[PDB]
């Protein structure tokens, strides 16, 4: 199979990464479109061998799978260009935080009646192939076009289907983690760095520590806090840095930075049209 | 390039007009005399800057506007339907209406210019008063009927007093939230860390001078870098030193969110005092 | 003049591409010793033209003004090694916080009785050449070593003689300086992210805003104060800005930094000998 | 000279107005004439001992007046003009002092009755019993020039006084209006910081008081920014910048933008509810 | 009478000026020494007719009432490089912060065994003669020595003898006062700024509204929240406002000032008691 990408940013180069990392498909059996090519994110892609145009309608004509990996204020205009070049063979896969599907298969439909349309929500990570991605179905999606779409997605990543109305939530939480995961690795390695560790080994030590205790979960049957038990001892080093975490709230600016990002991805929708 | 020689107003004679004019006759791209500047008050401290240097000043915006090829603007928004009311009949069709004033869109300008001549070149200008030496930040968005040599023209001048690019209008607002209230970020911030060299014993003049050239070699450090601004902050601080220290503290007070909270307080109430025109 | 560096960490490559970007020194008149050659600051002294030796004693032989660009506990063992190798020609600049001179002196003189030691507090920007840096000078100092040292400092930036009790203050303002500044570019950046600017473009206004501010201060005889009032108008954009930075604790936030690494500074040397 | 002056209302504003005109030396007192429905006032008591002229009836005011201050709440207004309207002649200049009363609305109710009433809008504070008040005022559609500079030359005798346009007065009426309060409360506190420390109450009030009265006359004499001010009297080290220190974390220079807001938003409100 | 200042700071100016202004002295019975007198009150003061001398020695020759006006880490070398010099006529008048009369009078009796010592506390409003000063007397003052000090300090503010174990406290009321009103000030000016002020005339209204309310507590018999409850009308502007100053702790913030401004006095002290 063909897949193409509309918008040639992180997420184009990330999928297109992971998914000829995991073998899936070949380099030159992708193609990607941006309209700006200056991009570093292109300048990737091309020592891959991915096929790159200016030409959006180009892209479209060689594939089958058709990913919109643009912004959601840019999903329209593509749609305005790209519609009457859709064909019965096209699965169009919307990535954009907030844009329905709705949204899409009406503006579609004003060229032919019954487009394929599925709404994907993943994040960066599958450029290592440790995604997570979400995707719900279309109106006109038939039950094969999901199916294919979790088999190409699991290869990069944790993939499942949801109802739509999860998505927003789905971005607030598996979407914007990585930046929060960023953000809390950066501060680990400032404090470790602030009791005396080189800077190089504090990040390397404080993201062996984030990716072993959520293999950890993953893996375990156990409730986060019944793991979380078993590392601290009675009076020791981990109880006494709990309670500082807990004194700040921790647990409460986690839970306020979810809401709002879900929170932002429906005002992103009630912008649109 | 392009050959100026040309003849710049300014309506308003405040700090901008100042700033500008200051910049732009150090820079050597225009003469003291080929710029006018008209204001409703003559008792301002920057009218008698503007007469030291040699620029004609007027009560009289219809005389600025004869005077100028490129007209810049620095009336609030509740203001602009009295000022392009009155020069309205005045504009030619060798002027570039240069605006720079927050939250006055080019849709606005043009609508009540057009009333009087069909295609006015009007220009959307976001800068900042560092431009008086030379180190200003600006960007600008072009209208309807800017010739694209009006571009180029806008963005030659300004580039002789700072870093100049072109934007789509809609992210000014934010612009003015980041660079054009930034210089005030920063003053308030070296009043503090002088504050901070006093409390622990330095001379106040000494704690000035030594805090702004922090800052100076910083900003110089981070532009002619291609490290992200966390590279640079990991590679000063060595581990258990005092910098980290430092930097813990102001992360307790949470620094950067007040930082972030002020760009968008500064872009918010640019879209407010759009809202108050029409 | 023949300079040398013990040290070859992020202080040495900032002096040395500053010296000789300068033109004050060839960077063939330049040697630098690193007890670690993986640095990456070492990988760049060598595309430079600087020589660079693992062995401090060959420093200090081909060496008259000294620099000791090392950390605060690395500064005694560096003085055992090397003092019976220090001559009557040489000047010794001690760059690490909190050590004094004293102290240097007292270990060097063990050696030969009238070390001409001086003290020096610099920071990151030299690199660019605008740096900030003030010295103070030793007991056998010559008149000429202090002259001598500002000529120096003063092609790489502002450099100016203090009293050594005012060194640990200056450190925690232009010599953590630097980093307050980082920090505030990188939440700046964030600021205008958030607000709809692409991340490279608000890096580049934001930092374009403190270096315009820093200068205008500098070629002003006004307060600070007064160039903010003359950013603000009155109910404008920028006074609604200063307020939620006033209701923050900004001002405070930038005091206690000051505060903070000028007493660990202090601390530094409580803990040496 | 033969100037009449009066006063709708006979409470702190009319009170303090008329003690500083009288100690001035601009005004005597028997010139002076001030109504209010309550006579049990305390403020009503020392204008009697002052000369003033009291009545129960506003109409009575008018008549004696030349220049009517309206030194009433903000919510009355509207019911003075109703009484007296028809009292109103071509010699009055009718000046209100009421927080948020804005001239438009004044002078449409007047107009019903005579069609060009001379108002203008005051600010002023309390401190004018001193003669050390802080004063603005805006000129309305029918004011001559001469009652500007008229006004102008009363206010300035018991204090600073100067014109401004009218929608600047609601925020004078949060920094100047309301600022003595902020500076009672500071003194309250600055006394009670003294007091913790171990000097007398007595003592305590009377030095905060000085420093403040000082450092103020200090900022009017010099040219220079309150912060270079603060700058030049903060020595390396010492005292004073520490205290600056503890009152920066407590966000001192916040809470006095917040409440100059605060009343002048409140000022606005007071408009909203009126008409 | 002659008097001399030993230290040409801002203090010893301001008392200079408000003397001169009282007409209590002639400026040529004055003179001010300072070894490095780069302040422009070297022009001032030449303009004012004070006499002007790098050397302590010949301001101590010339004056009968000696004001010691530097730091207090300063008062012992300026008593050490005097103390011979002291005569039977000579008043020592020390305004440093935190030194002791004991500590002054220990100094100074290794010269001459009774030295005529007074402790000062004033402000700079004495620049605009309404200064607040207290003093105490020392152990060999004469009884005409505090009523010549009062006499002569009454000329520019308010003057009162005290117990010297209040001085500390009066440093953090009346002494730092003065830049707790101009930070006020300049605050207040802001917020006028905010609600559309000009900042010139918001800082005039702001100055304005603090002497005025000084004043009116000065002059007045009731207490200082008498004054507050005759400002604030029910439901009005002023109460609005004060509730937001309240909600702050607007009160605590003031007294934590004078507490921290009294306590580092009382660790400001140099010599020995």
């Known amino acids: 199979?063909?897949?193409?990408?509309?918008?040639?940013?992180?997420?184009?180069?990330?999928?297109?990464?992971?998914?000829?990392?995991?073998?899936?498909?070949?380099?030159?059996?992708?193609?990607?479109?941006?309209?700006?090519?200056?991009?570093?994110?292109?300048?990737?892609?091309?020592?891959?061998?991915?096929?790159?145009?200016?030409?959006?309608?180009?892209?479209?004509?060689?594939?089958?799978?058709?990913?919109?990996?643009?912004?959601?204020?840019?999903?329209?205009?593509?749609?305005?260009?790209?519609?009457?070049?859709?064909?019965?063979?096209?699965?169009?896969?919307?990535?954009?935080?907030?844009?329905?599907?709705?949204?899409?298969?009406?503006?579609?439909?004003?060229?032919?009646?019954?487009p394929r349309v599925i709404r994907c929500m993943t994040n960066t990570p599958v450029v290592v192939r440790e995604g997570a991605t979400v995707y719900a179905t279309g109106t006109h999606a038939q039950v094969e076009d999901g199916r294919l779409m979790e088999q190409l997605l699991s290869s990069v990543g944790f993939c499942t289907e949801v109802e739509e109305d999860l998505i927003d939530?789905?971005?607030?939480?598996?979407?914007?983690?990585?930046?929060?995961?960023?953000?809390?690795?950066?501060?680990?390695?400032?404090?470790?760095?602030?009791?005396?560790?080189?800077?190089?080994?504090?990040?390397?030590?404080?993201?062996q520590a984030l990716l072993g205790a959520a293999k950890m979960l993953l893996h375990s049957e156990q409730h986060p806090g019944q793991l979380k038990d078993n590392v601290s001892s009675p009076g020791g080093a981990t109880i006494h840095a709990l309670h500082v975490l807990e004194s700040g709230g921790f647990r409460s600016l986690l839970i306020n930075a979810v809401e709002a990002s879900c929170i932002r991805t429906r005002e992103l929708q009630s912008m649109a049209d």
């Open 1 to 114: 199979m063909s897949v193409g990408f509309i918008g040639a940013g992180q997420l184009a180069f990330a999928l297109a990464k992971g998914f000829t990392a995991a073998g899936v498909l070949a380099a030159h059996k992708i193609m990607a479109s941006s309209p700006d090519m200056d991009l570093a994110t292109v300048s990737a892609l091309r020592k891959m061998g991915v096929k790159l145009t200016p030409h959006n309608k180009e892209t479209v004509q060689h594939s089958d799978v058709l990913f919109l990996a643009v912004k959601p204020h840019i999903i329209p205009f593509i749609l305005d260009e790209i519609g009457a070049d859709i064909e019965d063979r096209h699965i169009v896969v919307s990535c954009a935080a907030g844009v329905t599907i709705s949204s899409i298969e009406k503006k579609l439909s004003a060229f032919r009646p019954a």
């Open 169 to 207: 939530a789905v971005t607030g939480l598996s979407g914007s983690g990585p930046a929060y995961a960023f953000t809390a690795l950066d501060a680990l390695a400032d404090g470790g760095v602030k009791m005396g560790l080189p800077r190089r080994l504090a990040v390397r030590l404080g993201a």
